[PDB]
């Protein structure tokens, strides 16, 4: 299993303009548009990304497009960030899909504030890590998505994918 597999399975794939779970104007597997209450926004937003006059619709593969930036992105961003580079350096393959998907939904900056638990996943702490991980909102907001990273973080498989 791979990244998009499971960024597939935890984002659904929509190709119309459509609310995330936090109400915000979003397209693909999981492409944000805009943070803003107007829909004329979020298609001006989709437009610009696409190229084209999209009518807020787009095709599979213009998702697919957008899906090979955003995690390209992602990991980019993982990259270059000081708080997250060692963490991810110091990971298995497994584990580094899980930090990959946490820093895709909720951004560098959000991930780069879990102090605690991005310690003790560098020092291999699994355990104590996925105990840490799950009282934060992310946890409360999107519990059945936050099981299945956490119990990647915790096992090193993929077996919460595995049933999916």
């Given amino acids: 299993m791979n990244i998009f597999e499971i960024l597939r399975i935890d984002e659904g794939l929509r190709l119309k303009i459509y609310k995330?779970?936090?109400?915000?104007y979003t397209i693909g597997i999981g492409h944000l548009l805009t943070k803003s209450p107007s829909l004329n926004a979020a298609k001006s937003?989709?437009?610009?990304?696409?190229?084209r006059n999209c009518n807020g619709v787009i095709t599979k593969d213009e998702?697919?497009?957008?899906?090979?930036?955003?995690?390209?992105?992602?990991?980019?961003?993982?990259?270059?960030?000081?708080?997250l580079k060692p963490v991810y350096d110091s990971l298995d393959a497994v584990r580094r899909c899980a930090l990959i998907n946490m820093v895709f939904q909720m951004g560098e900056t959000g991930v780069a504030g879990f102090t605690n638990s991005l310690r003790m996943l560098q020092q291999k702490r699994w355990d104590?890590?996925?105990?840490?991980?799950?009282?934060?909102?992310?946890?409360?907001?999107?519990?059945?998505?936050?099981?299945?990273?956490?119990?990647?973080?915790?096992?090193?498989?993929?077996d919460a994918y595995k049933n999916l």
């Fill in 45 to 51: 937003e989709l437009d610009k990304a696409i190229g």
């Fill in 128 to 158: 104590e890590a996925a105990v840490n991980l799950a009282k934060s909102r992310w946890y409360n907001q999107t519990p059945n998505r936050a099981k299945r990273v956490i119990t990647t973080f915790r096992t090193g498989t993929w």
């Fill in 20 to 24: 995330d779970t936090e109400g915000y």
């Fill in 63 to 83: 998702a697919e497009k957008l899906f090979n930036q955003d995690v390209d992105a992602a990991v980019r961003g993982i990259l270059r960030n000081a708080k």
